[PDB]
Amino acid sequence: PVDVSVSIFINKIYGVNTLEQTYKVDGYIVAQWTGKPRKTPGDKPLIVENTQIERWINNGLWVPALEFINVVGSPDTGNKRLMLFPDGRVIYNARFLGSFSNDMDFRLFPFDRQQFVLELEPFSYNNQQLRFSDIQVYTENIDNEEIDEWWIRGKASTHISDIRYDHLSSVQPNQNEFSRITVRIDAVRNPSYYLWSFILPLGLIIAASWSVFWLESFSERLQTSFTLMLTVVAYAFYTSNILPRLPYTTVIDQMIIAGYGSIFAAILLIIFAHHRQANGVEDDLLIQRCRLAFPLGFLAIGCVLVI
Amino acid sequence: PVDVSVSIFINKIYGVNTLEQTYKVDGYIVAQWTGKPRKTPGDKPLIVENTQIERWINNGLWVPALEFINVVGSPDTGNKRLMLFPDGRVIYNARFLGSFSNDMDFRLFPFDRQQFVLELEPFSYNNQQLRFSDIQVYTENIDNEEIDEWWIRGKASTHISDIRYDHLSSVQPNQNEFSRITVRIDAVRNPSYYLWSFILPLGLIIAASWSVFWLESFSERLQTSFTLMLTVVAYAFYTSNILPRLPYTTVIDQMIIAGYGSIFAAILLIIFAHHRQANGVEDDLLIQRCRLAFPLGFLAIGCVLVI
Amino acid sequence: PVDVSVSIFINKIYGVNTLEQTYKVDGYIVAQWTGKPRKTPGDKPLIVENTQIERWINNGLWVPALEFINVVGSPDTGNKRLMLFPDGRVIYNARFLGSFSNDMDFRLFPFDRQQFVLELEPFSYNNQQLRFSDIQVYTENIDNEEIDEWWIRGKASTHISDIRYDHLSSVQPNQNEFSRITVRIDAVRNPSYYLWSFILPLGLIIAASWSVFWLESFSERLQTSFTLMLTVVAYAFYTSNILPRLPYTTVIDQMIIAGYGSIFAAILLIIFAHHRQANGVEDDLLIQRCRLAFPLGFLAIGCVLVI
Amino acid sequence: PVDVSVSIFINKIYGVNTLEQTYKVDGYIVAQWTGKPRKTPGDKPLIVENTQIERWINNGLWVPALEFINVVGSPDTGNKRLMLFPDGRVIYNARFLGSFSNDMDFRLFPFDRQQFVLELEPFSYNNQQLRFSDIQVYTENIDNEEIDEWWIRGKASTHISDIRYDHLSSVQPNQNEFSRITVRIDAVRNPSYYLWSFILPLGLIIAASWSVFWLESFSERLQTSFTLMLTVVAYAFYTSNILPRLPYTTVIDQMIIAGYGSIFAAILLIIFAHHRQANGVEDDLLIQRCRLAFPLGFLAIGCVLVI
Amino acid sequence: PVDVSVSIFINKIYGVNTLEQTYKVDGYIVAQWTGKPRKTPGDKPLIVENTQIERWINNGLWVPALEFINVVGSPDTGNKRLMLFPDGRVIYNARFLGSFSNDMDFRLFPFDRQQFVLELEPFSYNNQQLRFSDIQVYTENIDNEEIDEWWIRGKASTHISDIRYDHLSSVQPNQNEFSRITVRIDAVRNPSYYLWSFILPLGLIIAASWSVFWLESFSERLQTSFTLMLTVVAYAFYTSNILPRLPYTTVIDQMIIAGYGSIFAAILLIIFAHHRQANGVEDDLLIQRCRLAFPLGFLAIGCVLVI
Ligand SMILES: [Ba+2]
Ligand SMILES: [Ba+2]
Ligand SMILES: [Ba+2]
Ligand SMILES: [Ba+2]
Ligand SMILES: [Ba+2]
Ligand SMILES: [Ba+2]
Ligand SMILES: [Ba+2]
Ligand SMILES: [Ba+2]
Ligand SMILES: [Ba+2]
Ligand SMILES: [Ba+2]
Ligand SMILES: [Ba+2]
Ligand SMILES: [Ba+2]
Incomplete structure (x- = not known):
């Protein structure tokens, strides 16, 4: 079981679609796991940018694909980066903009309590483990409230759980279970x-x-x-x-x-x-x-x- | 004739376009067929993620292209994965969002009986056979009915048939016939x-x-x-x-x-x-x-x- | 002069834009020409799917680029396939969705006679010849007329002509002429x-x-x-x-x-x-x-x- | 200084955006310059289509990048082609659809005199010279006037000038100057x-x-x-x-x-x-x-x- | 610490979205840093255009990825170019169109004071330093004021600062700090x-x-x-x-x-x-x-x- 530390930076939330129950999120995602020690040029960690990452993957470098469960379509992936330390740790940093889904009740509409959720989870790996989740919402919730459409209440929220998939391949016994990060942000309409x-x-x-x-x-x-x-x-x-x-x-x-x-x-x-x-x-x-x-x-x- | 087991997981149905008679579907598709036994690292099955699958195909690995017949345009394909077991079975798992077509009668409009269909079928292969189709609609039909726009009635539906194409190349006799999976979901408007x-x-x-x-x-x-x-x-x-x-x-x-x-x-x-x-x-x-x-x-x- | 047999399958016509005089077409295109005999694995023809086709082209396989003259932008190309027979024939099959242009008179608007045209023609090759064109509109014209927006009259139409380009490079004499397939479908508004x-x-x-x-x-x-x-x-x-x-x-x-x-x-x-x-x-x-x-x-x- | 002959074929002009002062153009661009003689298969000129052009560029073939100055975003590039003659000339032919910018005065709006401009110019090359510009607007200006939204007056217009960029790198003296093709088409609203x-x-x-x-x-x-x-x-x-x-x-x-x-x-x-x-x-x-x-x-x- | 000189040319600002607080910018970006001397063909600097740049990067050429902080999604990148001088300097020139974000107060709406900002900053590099920023807005602010929607006041504005990221990886002490270019343009609505x-x-x-x-x-x-x-x-x-x-x-x-x-x-x-x-x-x-x-x-x- 590989320990993976996830940090998510939320830049902006917008483009709420009431009919589709969908909302746009722009920000960064950072994943850090510790692999086998490596020899970098000098001692200093290696920086691998966008196109090169694929080249490293083709050489047998291991890069788990993390999926947003509640995403709609596929995200717009900006600049992405791998950071390889000689002591073996690997840090994946990428910028994304994506449309996400969640249950939304508008029946109160003028006065609305909605919550914006992100659901992250490894695509193919049942034993790889999400160590901890840290969400930086630091883009100021209260600066100008009456300017921004939504008023964000509190700093994020976090859950790391184990999701079990009942229907699966021929081999049940030990792995139905994937680790899932759930990030929820409560907001109230103006x-x-x-x-x-x-x-x-x-x-x-x-x-x-x-x-x-x-x-x-x-x-x-x-x-x-x-x-x-x-x-x-x-x-x-x-x-x-x-x-x-x-x-x-x-x-x-x-x-x-x-x-x-x-x-x-x-x-x-x-x-x-x-x-x-x-x-x-x-x-x-x-x-x-x-x-x-x-x-x-x-x-x-x-x-x-x-x- | 190769036996292929298909499982389809429906996450969301939305974005109905009345004029175009089109509707959006997001979910997963899983295809499992049994090939020649292989030697994996250790005994444990091999996991091949997105970019690598192509590399395996270029080495002569066989991956049938499955086409959605009733799709409009080309689907948004998310993370995709191959799972290679040493005993020879191969499991393709992919996430998709796509716009699909079907005949839709709105003449009753306020009270509507519509049905959402998916039509799957091998692109190039006449003898390769779809063993069985399993549809997991498990995302709850009745939880909040008056929230969701459409009320889904019953759990899916399934047909596996043989479609014959009359107009074809110079060689008729034994293969006009392709196996087609048809998945229909009945729904009623609120x-x-x-x-x-x-x-x-x-x-x-x-x-x-x-x-x-x-x-x-x-x-x-x-x-x-x-x-x-x-x-x-x-x-x-x-x-x-x-x-x-x-x-x-x-x-x-x-x-x-x-x-x-x-x-x-x-x-x-x-x-x-x-x-x-x-x-x-x-x-x-x-x-x-x-x-x-x-x-x-x-x-x-x-x-x-x-x- | 290479003989090329074209078959076009029309799945759907929609998304008429009156201002832009444009309409959407989804379907398949099939091109068959006979090249030099080849040795396939076994005797059975070879199937080359999407990504591999490029690889074959890089090895000197010849694949004429066919252009839609009246298309707007570039089409959405779905799954594509090459079929290589040992006796030398090659069959290109691809799925496309594209926006097409044509002259449209709406002055009668409530009662409209419009015609949807596709214009195909080799991009770079003056002597390569389109043998015959076959259009399968088989998706039923009359099933439910009052459901579908447009009523399609008759089965397609076909012309294969030679277009001469006056303004050209330094060498005139023998090739100003390219073979063009024109497919027209008459339809009347409901x-x-x-x-x-x-x-x-x-x-x-x-x-x-x-x-x-x-x-x-x-x-x-x-x-x-x-x-x-x-x-x-x-x-x-x-x-x-x-x-x-x-x-x-x-x-x-x-x-x-x-x-x-x-x-x-x-x-x-x-x-x-x-x-x-x-x-x-x-x-x-x-x-x-x-x-x-x-x-x-x-x-x-x-x-x-x-x- | 390399002489380059440009020919531009205008198929359609549409999608005028009054707010953005932008208009859509679809057509072809042809660039012809004379390089070093070459040995083609046979004597006949060589045809290099889309994906292969890049391969030729990687082998040291020289292909100037021409930029549309007044374009918005990046154009939709269709089929593209290189034609290599044994006597050394090279002809680049490509199909494009792009959104272009220009100053537009709508103050007269019901009766409007507007002009649609294309501005072409080499991206990186100060001494390479545009020999002459030829514009084929041949798609008929007057056939049906009251059908088409805009009435085009006269056949195109042309200018080839030298643009000087004042602010530049450390080396001024001999090259501030790039050759620019300007194509203007006068039109009047119906x-x-x-x-x-x-x-x-x-x-x-x-x-x-x-x-x-x-x-x-x-x-x-x-x-x-x-x-x-x-x-x-x-x-x-x-x-x-x-x-x-x-x-x-x-x-x-x-x-x-x-x-x-x-x-x-x-x-x-x-x-x-x-x-x-x-x-x-x-x-x-x-x-x-x-x-x-x-x-x-x-x-x-x-x-x-x-x- | 590598010194980088940035010059930004603003062609057009448009497509203001009041709800999303977003605005479109089209222009050029130029980055100049001095690397190790090189041997060019002849003495004259080398010009590397679009597709080739990647090839140079794969050979170990160093090209920092610069990110627009306030951008939404990913920009439309037009023609791009590298210029390699024998004395070691490298000049990156690219054309872009992108949607950018900033705080916008419309409460005064008919009479509005808004400001359009660009925020540039190296993606992966903490010690690489932005030497100076030069903004060419030269596209005329006052030519026709009552034509253009917005009246631009003064020529740009510039700041080069050091942004410190508190939350970071295990190694704090010397680099929390990245150099950021901020370009602001004041404008008033008509x-x-x-x-x-x-x-x-x-x-x-x-x-x-x-x-x-x-x-x-x-x-x-x-x-x-x-x-x-x-x-x-x-x-x-x-x-x-x-x-x-x-x-x-x-x-x-x-x-x-x-x-x-x-x-x-x-x-x-x-x-x-x-x-x-x-x-x-x-x-x-x-x-x-x-x-x-x-x-x-x-x-x-x-x-x-x-x-
Ligand atoms: Ba992308
Ligand atoms: Ba994709
Ligand atoms: Ba039908
Ligand atoms: Ba639900
Ligand atoms: Ba309206
Ligand atoms: Ba595609
Ligand atoms: Ba393209
Ligand atoms: Ba015409
Ligand atoms: Ba190499
Ligand atoms: Ba690009
Ligand atoms: Ba803010
Ligand atoms: Ba101007």
Whole structure:
């Protein structure tokens, strides 16, 4: 069992794809294991850069292939390097940019708790062992929070476990097990933009739609309600175009639905008030006075929902 | 005829392209056939990783090229590996991400039954035989259903058949036939988002468009109907922008068309009511009382259509 | 002059880009020419797969480079293979996906007659001759027509010609001429989606815009006409966003323009009716009765245009 | 100083990016210089195709690297070829597709005069000389003009100059100078689509906005003006979505601004007419009669602007 | 410690991605260090072009890998060249296009002060020293300012520093330190397009929304206010579609919010005026006369905000 020390440097996280549940990571990966002592030019360690590494591999140098389990496609590998010390240790350093996968729940969307994971694991080697994992996130989490889209909470996280693959080749007994490094980074979305540019005017619009009951004539009350409907549709459009695509409804979508339902309910009451009648036209006092009931009645449901 | 055992591990299915009828698959492929016994270092099997495999092929090692028939372009091949046992068996393991093709009917779109297929088959070898196919979909179908976009039903499916190519080279008689592995996975789309964020408010809008008959003045009835038309167009826009592009109409599109037709019909009746007349202005009782007939008359067609 | 037999298998055609006049083709290409007899292992023909082909070329094996003339960029070349028979024939088989160019007229757009062309021709060799071209389109043209976006008419088409390049190097006399294979596939667009989801509601909207003349008050007639204008703009938007981008106007765009012109004309008549007058207000009978003339007067132009 | 004859064949120009000031070119490049006589197989010139060229370079064959100065990124290089004549001449032929840069002024946008430039120049060689440049644009400029987006005027253009680089290595005196080929192609945009589908209905809308003064009641005049404002915004949207993105205003944008300004001015006059008054309500005759002044007053500015 | 002289030529800066905080740079990089004297053919320096450089590296020629620290992915490397002088100096010249990262604050967006940075640094070598950095931005900053999107202020900027990496391998004492070149270019966005096509009509719209108080009837005042709301939503859409996506609100977004708030406030006052009353209907003089207060009251906040 060969001991391998992994260090991962995270430069940037970006390009979140909500539909594909995918996010981009750029950084460095460093792997250090101790092999057989060697004779370098002078005593000083040897530096082997990109194209030459292959040449060394062809001469029988041993370089385990480490795979990102949760990666999508194949990473963009930048400059890579081998460092060979005379005392036998070997240090592989490479730069990568890759698209990674993980389970992501956006149902809370404006206010989101997401976590970005990297899963590393040897491709072909069951007994080679990951000694320890060190993650340098040092690119500052809090410098400007309201600039960066996501606010990163705490410094990384680490797990080194043994994954067992049940379905395998003819020889079971001693190796189903591969060592896996899991690095998770917790992050929270910045609600500002969505609160001010979406939630707020949406609220204003809903509240304003309640003002239909302060109209005098029935005709006015109806004809206006249609304009309201149109406004909600237009808003639904404005949101849907900018907002990220999802298989499910977010909080904002629910607000929109609440808008539609509020207006349709208003329509029903407005028509009901007219044709529930003394002779044919009598309009209900308390009902036309629902201008108080409707806003809080909505607010009741509003306070009930997140709860 | 060489026996080849194939195992395919499906990690993720995503990136469905409705227009191109294409979907992305990420996973592993494992091929195992038994060759001539060999002498490995020690007794233990030999592990040959990525770049080295080519070197082994150049030395006369035999590695059949397996082709995905239904793939689009060429797959993104990750880490690949050969495992050479002294008793002669050879196991090829590779990681891939690829875009695959298949016939897809979206006419039911909000509620969709689709099936994702992989078609494997040797490129150049007519007699080499696929022994058996095993598909590990083990990445959990039901864990969170309402998170994942598609709900996968059952565990995979398998067929191993012999495909005959009629048009071929000068020598017909014994080999037109190649062994083909076909893996199909049945899946059903999650209607939630579309029901709540599309179907529902669309319904509310249609129903509301029926309220035009509860207006008193002819002018009101018309002028309002135009606002309704506008609203339906705006909605058609909001849907069309978000929804996937298709060569054909879905259920929702039909609903939209139903909206247009309902409103235009309403216009016709509204004008007809005015100018079918006692003197010139007489409005038809039963017709202005169509407020009952129109909703169910639509509903009749609605219940007739899916039927 | 070397005789070369080409067979092309078309798997899929897709990704039409209207602006770039480009379309994607995936399939196989097979080239067969007869060289000098060879000694294979056993008698059986030799199979040389991807990476090895280059190695054979470096040993002086002759492999003409065939170029797609109308290709854009360079194709995605999948698995490729050489088959070497002892009697001297050589068969090159490769899989490709590529973007191809051709002249495309979309002026009829909803109903389109387009043709997809492949142009093959030796890169460096003036005397090497393409014996015959065979195109297997066998992937079924008619299975489900209303699923596939394009309906393919007939089985392919073929031409083998000699192209002469006037401008050339210092030596003219005997070779300006290269053999070119041209494969054309005629296809017709499926109008369904565009008829129902675009043409139809657009028509309904136009017809409805004629109902403005059934209004009583001048004010109503005007104020409504503006809402109509807005509706046409909104519709123009909804179409333009979904529909493919073009340098020219399609049929639908013309319909839109017809809408604008109809409404503006309506405005002119509505204002004219008011201020062409007995004293100042007199409205013209026949003119307010143009509710008959306008629809057919439009229809006249409509029946005149395609004609 | 080595004489090099360059011939460039332009197949297609497309993919204009207004923001990046970039355009795509596909074609062939041919370079011919005369080296030392050689012994070919037979007397006939030698054909060296793609992969082999490198092999020849490694044997000390001399192949100058020609760089496109104005290219963006690196070109997609298709099939390439060397032709070696026994009398010593060498002809390099390659196919390329590349994104090129040039200064582009879109301020006139609907009617545009643009020019597409290619700048070629040896990478490392100060004394090697470009003998002459020949550009075959022969792909027909005028066949169908209203199909192609751009109308190409005249056949190419050519310049061969000497560029001097001031800032250089330690040795100045005799070589700051590299030979540069510049190929420019003048082209004019097709205004049709923009005239009919944009300019025209925009005009109709503006003209129609002048009809607000033919309304009787002040309320009507205002309430309608708002609908007009909305219509102009909607139109601004429809244009902005389809039209290419720019750092500056085009002609159409100016028209839009003119729309806004016209309507706001109308608002100001409408309110002014009401509250500039005999008692409080008196409306100005000449002002309500500005229905004549406003259209030409706008037209005055319109005829003044391009002038 | 090897002295390395770097010169960087900036051709173009473009493709700013606001969300990813990324921008494209195209140009040349030149690195000059003095090695061991060599014997060239003749006395004249040797020119080694693209593919050959690798061959020289394989023979033990030393070519430090320089990394762009702030690059995203890996650059598109064009033609590259080595120049070997007999006196031992070596000059590496390469052309590159790459996407680079940097902190970008768009909160001021229409008027933006941004700075484009390049960070260069040896990949594997702690003692090799960057002698000096020279940046040729010579592509003209001021030629046409209103054409180019960004106005570049001053000629570049330069820093050469020593970066210390705390976390490292087992040997600390003398080398934590790598030499880093930092090149920063200050630029300011061109407000024209946004002022005229966005800020201005937005202002006109706001001002116009104040005209609601000049209406007589309460009904008019309300029903109109809704149309205003719709107009602001439509405008919010038109802006949001064209404008760049951000995690935060810009100035324009704030203006939009101000619009919504202004209209909602107007609604509140309009309803309050009606139902704060003598009997039930009395409308407040000063309140209906707020037509003066509202515009400046807004303007007060407007002048307070940037301040
Ligand atoms: Ba790479
Ligand atoms: Ba790959
Ligand atoms: Ba099919
Ligand atoms: Ba899962
Ligand atoms: Ba490939
Ligand atoms: Ba879009
Ligand atoms: Ba290439
Ligand atoms: Ba042509
Ligand atoms: Ba050598
Ligand atoms: Ba390169
Ligand atoms: Ba930062
Ligand atoms: Ba320039």
